[PDB]
Every structure is written in C-alpha cells, then in structure tokens.
C-alpha cells in the first residue's frame, strides 16, 4: 500500500489554518469494518509522537486543535492555530494491510 | 535414487504380501464363520451377494447408525442454510450458522447437551479473561476430567434414555474441549490491535457451534475460521455444485470400500477372539494387522471427508485428509501426516509453549512426553492408551536421536566418503523397516488392546524369532524402499 | 513508561550489530514491540514486530533473512549482518487496540563507514 | 483421533 502526502513542504505563519492530505493507493478499510489510519508528528532530532489514532479520533495528551477528517481512501489533517510547537514532519500511517507503511512526510516551515 | 528395476521388484513384493495376507484372512474368515457367528452376531444384507458383515467395530457401527437417522439430514440442512445465507445475507452468515448449529445440537441431544456445551464455553471464556496460559490449560484439564468422573457419567446416563445419546454427548464435549482451548489460548496470546475485535463471546459461540465439526469433526483453527468468515467474496455456486458432485462420488467410493473390507474379512471379531488369535497362522496374523490399519485409514477417510466437503462448500480450507497408511514408514511421518488438524493443534499449543526441539535433548524429551501424555488422556486414558503413548514416545525419541546423530558433520562426511547414495538409501530402508515393525505393533496395541499386543509380540518376535521375524523384516524392508521413494514427492 | 536504547555504533561494513531496547514502567510481556528505521534520505519504514508473550517474531518481506529479534524477559534485541544501511533504528511499543505506537525509544544511530 | 471405545 503506497501512501502519498501533499504537499511535500509548506510554509505557515503563526496562527493559520493548515490542511495536509494523505491519499492511499487502495482502501484502508480493514476486515473488522474500521480503518486504522493515524498521524504522527516528529520534531527535529527526536522520536515521532502520535496525534490522531483512528480517523477523527485523538490521542490523550494532544490538544483540541488537531481535527483530522477522512474518506475511505483520502484523509486530511487540520491544524486550526499553528502555535509554534506544531513545526516538524507529519507522517500518515496505515495499519490495515500487512506490511504497514508510513507516508512520505510533510514539513511545516515559517515564512 | 535406485535403479527402476530394483524399485519395481520392491513394489511388486509389497503388493504381493499385501494381497496374499488379505487372501489368507479371507480364507480364515470363511472357515470360522459359524463359530464367529454364534459368538458375535453377524449382520445380513444383499449388498455383496449374500456374505455376512462383521459389525463389531464400535465406531463404525455407531457413526453409521447415527448418520442414517439424523446426521446426514442435519448436514444437508447446514449445506442449504449456508448457501441461502451466502446468497441473501453474506455479512450475517456466521450468526446464522451459529443459530443453526445450536438448533441442530438441541434437536439431536436435548436441552442438556446445549446446556453443557454453553457451560463449558462460558467457563473457558471467563477464565481466559485473566490472560494466563497456565490457568487456561488448568481449566481445560479440569473440564476434561469432569468427563472422566464416574458420578458425572452416572448423572448423564440418567439424563438420557437410549445410551447412544450419552456417547454422542461425550464425544461432542471431548471435541469442544479442544475447540475452546484453542480459542482461549489465542485470546491469551493476542497482542495486535486489529486482532482485538476477534476474541469476543459471539465469535467464541460461532466457533464452538459450527455444525460440520460439532460431533466428531477435526480441529479447525480459529484463525482460519475467522479469516474465512469475513471475506464477503462468494465462490461461484456453479463451481460449488461440481465440488459437491465430486465430493459425493469420492465419499461413496470410500464407504463402499470400507463395507467391502468389513464383509470380506472379520478382523474385529477375530481380534476379539484371543484363543483364535493364538491358533491362526503367521500370514493370517500379518494380514489381520494390515486389515486393521487399512480399515482404520478408510474409516477415518469417510469420517473426515464429510466435514471436509462441507467446509470446502462453505469456502474454508480444512486440514488435509490422512495419507494412506501403506506409505507410512516412520513414527515422525505417521504422526505428522495422519491427523493433520490435531497435529497442528498439538504443535502450536502443547509442544512449543513447553519448548520443542530448541532447548536440547532433555527439553525435547519433556515436550514429546507432555504431548503424548496429553494425547492419551484426551483419547480416554485407559491402560492400553497409556501403553500406546509410551511406545510412540519411545519411537519418536529414538528416531530423533538417530537423525540428529546422523546429521552431524563428522559422521555425515564419513558416510559421504565411505558409502554411495544407493547404499545409504538401502541402510535407511533397513532402519525404516526396523522402525515400521514397532510402529505397527504400537498401533495394534491401540486398535486391539494389550492382549492383542502381547500375542503379536510373543508370536512374531519371541516364539518365531529366527525366521518369522526375518521374513517380516525383509517384507518391511521392501515396503520401506517403496515408501521412502514415494516420500520425496511431498516431503 | 520509558524505552531506552543502547547507543551509537561505529562499525565496519563486514561486522554484525546487536542493538538493545529496555522498557520500564509497565508489564513488559503484556505488549508487543516494533522496530522502525529512518534513513537520512528517507522517511520511516516498519521492519517488523515480535510477540513479547510468546517470543514469535514476524518481519516485513523486505527485512527478511538477515535481521533477527530476540527477548531477554525486560529488554529486547535486534541483530543483523550489515550492508550499506546507515538508518536510525527506533524501538516502539504497540497497544492492545485501536492504535499502534503510543511510546517510542530514543533511537540508535548506525554508521557503517 | 477419537477415543475408539470397545464397549
Ligand atoms: C506395512 C504397511 C502398514 C504401516 C502402518 C503403520 C501405522 C498405521 C496405523 C494407523 C492406526 C491409527 C491409531 C492412532 C491414531 C489416533 O487416533 S491418535 C490422535 C492423532 N495425533 C497423535 O496421536 C499425536 C502425535 N504427536 C505429535 O504430533 C507431536 O506434535 C510430535 C510428534 C511430538 C511433534 O513432532 P514434529 O512435528 O516432527 O516436531 P519438530 O520435528 O520439532 O518440527 C515442528 C516445527 O515446529 C518448530 N519448532 C520446534 N520447536 C520450536 C520452538 N521451541 N519454538 C518455535 N518453533 C519450534 C520446528 O523448527 C519445526 O519447524 P518446521 O521445519 O516443521 O516448519
Ligand atoms: C503396497 C500397498 C499400497 C501402496 C504402496 C499404496 C499407496 C498409495 C498411494 C501412493 C496413495 C496416494 C497418496 C495419498 O492418497 O496419500 C494411496 C491412496 C489410497 N489408498 Fe493405497 N496403497 C496400498 C494399498 C492400499 C490398500 C490395500 C487399500 C485398501 C484396502 C488402499 C486404499 C487407499 C485409498 C482409499 C486411497 C485414497 C484414494 C483417494 O484419495 O481417492 N491402499 N495409496
């Protein structure tokens, strides 16, 4: 399963709306009847951290500005207010079809 | 590889002694017909021109009388209900089949049968909620001993009134034991997120009440079950019809062959007459042994081919049917290719968790002994079963030791520089014959009992040592060549 | 709950490698363990996981034949014979349901030349 | 498999 992310790197100003798109090659719907697609943010020089775990869900410590929507084959992550700690690389990840594959990565920058 | 003329002589001698021993057994059967009749009643039918039938085999007679009355109709009902569910509601097929299995178990075993199956399943699930493999195995062993309790036997015989329904209940519960043990162990071992939704109580009930394997059917893995029960892609009913036609033809051929053997030769009555076993000749004795093992093979072909056909219609992949016993030449091959489903269950849930061939020879001894002790206790735990288990454990251990000793680099290079591949094949055939004789003796202890075992031992290896034993070993050497040459196509 | 890895490794292209991951703060045998690798000119890549309760590993098809996972039940090791793979190896814990990687290690950098 | 009782 090949996951493509758009854009590759985008500049943002502090306090903007950001939308990152992840498109799979096939359907990420599992035999269980639910799709396991999740989002990870990696800051420079450390380990990735989970933000959204199932489509539209949210991890425990994550703030309330990381809404992520998604269709059956197209998914979107949204950041309402870029609070200067949301800069890094964002990966989408599917866990429905073996082997599990990460996305290409999207890099946020400041203009 | 041996020259083809050598291999042909070997196959010819093999078929020769098979058929001559069968002829000797037929002769003795025809000759002791009236005595065997006044001792054990023989059935009559016009299926084979007027020959009487030996109906002493408990399992064959029991399953045939149950199937001619209830089981064939209930299996046809399962087939048609499964097809209608696949046609109309493909997502609800597991629950529809669960309801049908519960209703069929009720119809054939009353309310107490369903109640007991539900109770066992509930207890196993509630204990598996702790996620401890030792505790799960302890619960399973206690539930299995509840069957061996005499007072419980009394209460259940009081429950039923025809004394065959009690045996049906016992066999059903014995197989349910393995089914919910597999489920509970997979639940204890689950660690993968997408697999979290598989071990629910509805799924356990659907796994336990799957009618093709409810009463006697082989052990189907829960992984394969839940994988196939969530595919949503049908399998071409037009091809299902042809699958059914070919399966029915093959099953009728097998049934006819088994009835032909039981009509021709009275192997079971003769094994029941020990004073007659002591007087029959050695050719008749060996023919009785071959007839026993081949009748068991064909009987279980029939008993496993109906659940296999129903699973193949449902779209599942069932465990493979037994390989012909006239091609087995070793303990390891026998116990890997006869009962594939139970072998896989044992490998996965008894052998490896105790520690298999990866922790030394003493660990291998302990694991193999645990496996065979469990198999004996599950088959019933009678003295002859424990004896069979000890003999098979010894055979497997000796074969493992000899193979590990031969596959060492030093001895392997010594052989590869001293003897040709032909001579090595012939030495392996001699060792395989010496092992096949003990395999046959152990399984004769399983099929006939301890007295039959001691009769065969005394009459073949003690009283007639110098020449009867050598003739048996030569015939088994030729047979071992044939079996080893055939084993390359699948090993 | 923290996962701590071994440290940087400077080795020549022919040697082997054994990296360790120690987990503290939870029952080690209750959850599985996954390995991810991050090459300098690439993103994350899943190498495989190993059942911590039974010690059964499963590798991705790409990372098969050379790598091996092992237990010391509360540490877990990865072993390989090297090639031109200078990735950074991350150790991750997998959850029982609904999401995979809740906790990660610090990362072990591997240099071959 | 099966017990295979004699009875
Ligand atoms: C003249 C012509 C007439 C001849 C005719 C003669 C006979 C004809 C009579 C018929 C009459 C029937 C009458 C009774 C028939 C019933 O009704 S009784 C019920 C049927 N089943 C039984 O009786 C039980 C037999 N016992 C078993 O199956 C046990 O599992 C055994 C036999 C001890 C295991 O044997 P095994 O499969 O060879 O085990 P092993 O060699 O270690 O390898 C297994 C795998 O597990 C892996 N493994 C091993 N240890 C570990 C570990 N610690 N961790 C992870 N993996 C491991 C191995 O690497 C190996 O990998 P593979 O290369 O296979 O992929
Ligand atoms: C020297 C004697 C024999 C040899 C070498 C031999 C060999 C074989 C082989 C190679 C197969 C196919 C492989 C397999 O199905 O696993 C087979 C199948 C079979 N054998 Fe034999 N066999 C012998 C005697 C017998 C006898 C005497 C009987 C019955 C009285 C018998 C009954 C069967 C049956 C029912 C099958 C399966 C047929 C099917 O799958 O449709 N065999 N045998």
JSON list of C-alpha atoms and ligand atoms in Angstrom, two decimals, chain B residues 11 14-19 22 250 254 257 261 294-295 297-298 301 321-327 479 482 486, ligand 2:
[
{"chain": "B", "resi": 11, "resn": "UNK", "atom": "CA", "xyz": [6.84, -52.51, -5.20]},
{"chain": "B", "resi": 14, "resn": "UNK", "atom": "CA", "xyz": [4.99, -55.12, -1.37]},
{"chain": "B", "resi": 15, "resn": "UNK", "atom": "CA", "xyz": [1.74, -55.58, -3.30]},
{"chain": "B", "resi": 16, "resn": "UNK", "atom": "CA", "xyz": [2.32, -59.33, -3.25]},
{"chain": "B", "resi": 17, "resn": "UNK", "atom": "CA", "xyz": [2.49, -59.72, 0.50]},
{"chain": "B", "resi": 18, "resn": "UNK", "atom": "CA", "xyz": [-0.42, -57.29, 0.99]},
{"chain": "B", "resi": 19, "resn": "UNK", "atom": "CA", "xyz": [-2.73, -59.27, -1.28]},
{"chain": "B", "resi": 22, "resn": "UNK", "atom": "CA", "xyz": [-5.63, -60.42, 2.62]},
{"chain": "B", "resi": 250, "resn": "UNK", "atom": "CA", "xyz": [-15.43, -39.92, -3.80]},
{"chain": "B", "resi": 254, "resn": "UNK", "atom": "CA", "xyz": [-14.71, -44.76, 0.19]},
{"chain": "B", "resi": 257, "resn": "UNK", "atom": "CA", "xyz": [-14.55, -49.87, 0.04]},
{"chain": "B", "resi": 261, "resn": "UNK", "atom": "CA", "xyz": [-13.47, -54.92, 3.68]},
{"chain": "B", "resi": 294, "resn": "UNK", "atom": "CA", "xyz": [-6.19, -50.04, 6.43]},
{"chain": "B", "resi": 295, "resn": "UNK", "atom": "CA", "xyz": [-9.76, -50.27, 7.75]},
{"chain": "B", "resi": 297, "resn": "UNK", "atom": "CA", "xyz": [-7.49, -45.45, 7.46]},
{"chain": "B", "resi": 298, "resn": "UNK", "atom": "CA", "xyz": [-10.56, -45.79, 5.23]},
{"chain": "B", "resi": 301, "resn": "UNK", "atom": "CA", "xyz": [-11.23, -41.02, 5.38]},
{"chain": "B", "resi": 321, "resn": "UNK", "atom": "CA", "xyz": [-7.08, -35.86, 4.93]},
{"chain": "B", "resi": 322, "resn": "UNK", "atom": "CA", "xyz": [-4.82, -38.68, 6.16]},
{"chain": "B", "resi": 323, "resn": "UNK", "atom": "CA", "xyz": [-2.19, -40.08, 3.84]},
{"chain": "B", "resi": 324, "resn": "UNK", "atom": "CA", "xyz": [-2.54, -43.76, 3.04]},
{"chain": "B", "resi": 325, "resn": "UNK", "atom": "CA", "xyz": [-1.08, -45.81, 5.88]},
{"chain": "B", "resi": 326, "resn": "UNK", "atom": "CA", "xyz": [0.54, -48.14, 3.32]},
{"chain": "B", "resi": 327, "resn": "UNK", "atom": "CA", "xyz": [3.01, -45.32, 2.60]},
{"chain": "B", "resi": 479, "resn": "UNK", "atom": "CA", "xyz": [7.90, -51.79, 1.71]},
{"chain": "B", "resi": 482, "resn": "UNK", "atom": "CA", "xyz": [8.70, -48.08, -1.70]},
{"chain": "B", "resi": 486, "resn": "UNK", "atom": "CA", "xyz": [7.38, -42.07, -2.64]},
{"chain": "E", "resi": 2, "resn": "LIG", "atom": "C1", "xyz": [1.52, -51.84, -1.16]},
{"chain": "E", "resi": 2, "resn": "LIG", "atom": "C2", "xyz": [0.28, -51.39, -0.97]},
{"chain": "E", "resi": 2, "resn": "LIG", "atom": "C3", "xyz": [-0.18, -49.92, -1.18]},
{"chain": "E", "resi": 2, "resn": "LIG", "atom": "C4", "xyz": [0.53, -48.84, -1.55]},
{"chain": "E", "resi": 2, "resn": "LIG", "atom": "C5", "xyz": [2.03, -48.73, -1.90]},
{"chain": "E", "resi": 2, "resn": "LIG", "atom": "C6", "xyz": [-0.38, -47.71, -1.59]},
{"chain": "E", "resi": 2, "resn": "LIG", "atom": "C7", "xyz": [-0.06, -46.42, -1.93]},
{"chain": "E", "resi": 2, "resn": "LIG", "atom": "C8", "xyz": [-0.95, -45.37, -2.03]},
{"chain": "E", "resi": 2, "resn": "LIG", "atom": "C9", "xyz": [-0.65, -44.05, -2.53]},
{"chain": "E", "resi": 2, "resn": "LIG", "atom": "C10", "xyz": [0.72, -43.57, -3.04]},
{"chain": "E", "resi": 2, "resn": "LIG", "atom": "C11", "xyz": [-1.77, -43.32, -2.46]},
{"chain": "E", "resi": 2, "resn": "LIG", "atom": "C12", "xyz": [-1.95, -41.85, -2.89]},
{"chain": "E", "resi": 2, "resn": "LIG", "atom": "C13", "xyz": [-1.29, -40.94, -1.86]},
{"chain": "E", "resi": 2, "resn": "LIG", "atom": "C14", "xyz": [-2.29, -40.50, -0.83]},
{"chain": "E", "resi": 2, "resn": "LIG", "atom": "O1", "xyz": [-3.51, -40.54, -1.11]},
{"chain": "E", "resi": 2, "resn": "LIG", "atom": "O2", "xyz": [-1.86, -40.11, 0.29]},
{"chain": "E", "resi": 2, "resn": "LIG", "atom": "C15", "xyz": [-2.82, -44.16, -1.92]},
{"chain": "E", "resi": 2, "resn": "LIG", "atom": "C16", "xyz": [-4.13, -43.79, -1.70]},
{"chain": "E", "resi": 2, "resn": "LIG", "atom": "C17", "xyz": [-5.13, -44.60, -1.24]},
{"chain": "E", "resi": 2, "resn": "LIG", "atom": "N1", "xyz": [-5.01, -45.93, -0.87]},
{"chain": "E", "resi": 2, "resn": "LIG", "atom": "FE1", "xyz": [-3.33, -47.04, -1.04]},
{"chain": "E", "resi": 2, "resn": "LIG", "atom": "N2", "xyz": [-1.64, -48.16, -1.23]},
{"chain": "E", "resi": 2, "resn": "LIG", "atom": "C18", "xyz": [-1.54, -49.51, -0.97]},
{"chain": "E", "resi": 2, "resn": "LIG", "atom": "C19", "xyz": [-2.57, -50.33, -0.57]},
{"chain": "E", "resi": 2, "resn": "LIG", "atom": "C20", "xyz": [-3.87, -49.96, -0.32]},
{"chain": "E", "resi": 2, "resn": "LIG", "atom": "C21", "xyz": [-4.94, -50.84, 0.08]},
{"chain": "E", "resi": 2, "resn": "LIG", "atom": "C22", "xyz": [-4.75, -52.36, 0.27]},
{"chain": "E", "resi": 2, "resn": "LIG", "atom": "C23", "xyz": [-6.05, -50.10, 0.23]},
{"chain": "E", "resi": 2, "resn": "LIG", "atom": "C24", "xyz": [-7.49, -50.52, 0.65]},
{"chain": "E", "resi": 2, "resn": "LIG", "atom": "C25", "xyz": [-7.84, -51.76, 1.00]},
{"chain": "E", "resi": 2, "resn": "LIG", "atom": "C26", "xyz": [-5.70, -48.72, -0.06]},
{"chain": "E", "resi": 2, "resn": "LIG", "atom": "C27", "xyz": [-6.55, -47.64, -0.02]},
{"chain": "E", "resi": 2, "resn": "LIG", "atom": "C28", "xyz": [-6.26, -46.37, -0.46]},
{"chain": "E", "resi": 2, "resn": "LIG", "atom": "C29", "xyz": [-7.18, -45.27, -0.58]},
{"chain": "E", "resi": 2, "resn": "LIG", "atom": "C30", "xyz": [-8.69, -45.32, -0.23]},
{"chain": "E", "resi": 2, "resn": "LIG", "atom": "C31", "xyz": [-6.51, -44.21, -1.04]},
{"chain": "E", "resi": 2, "resn": "LIG", "atom": "C32", "xyz": [-7.07, -42.80, -1.33]},
{"chain": "E", "resi": 2, "resn": "LIG", "atom": "C33", "xyz": [-7.91, -42.80, -2.60]},
{"chain": "E", "resi": 2, "resn": "LIG", "atom": "C34", "xyz": [-8.38, -41.40, -2.86]},
{"chain": "E", "resi": 2, "resn": "LIG", "atom": "O3", "xyz": [-7.74, -40.45, -2.33]},
{"chain": "E", "resi": 2, "resn": "LIG", "atom": "O4", "xyz": [-9.38, -41.22, -3.60]},
{"chain": "E", "resi": 2, "resn": "LIG", "atom": "N3", "xyz": [-4.37, -48.67, -0.39]},
{"chain": "E", "resi": 2, "resn": "LIG", "atom": "N4", "xyz": [-2.28, -45.40, -1.67]}
]
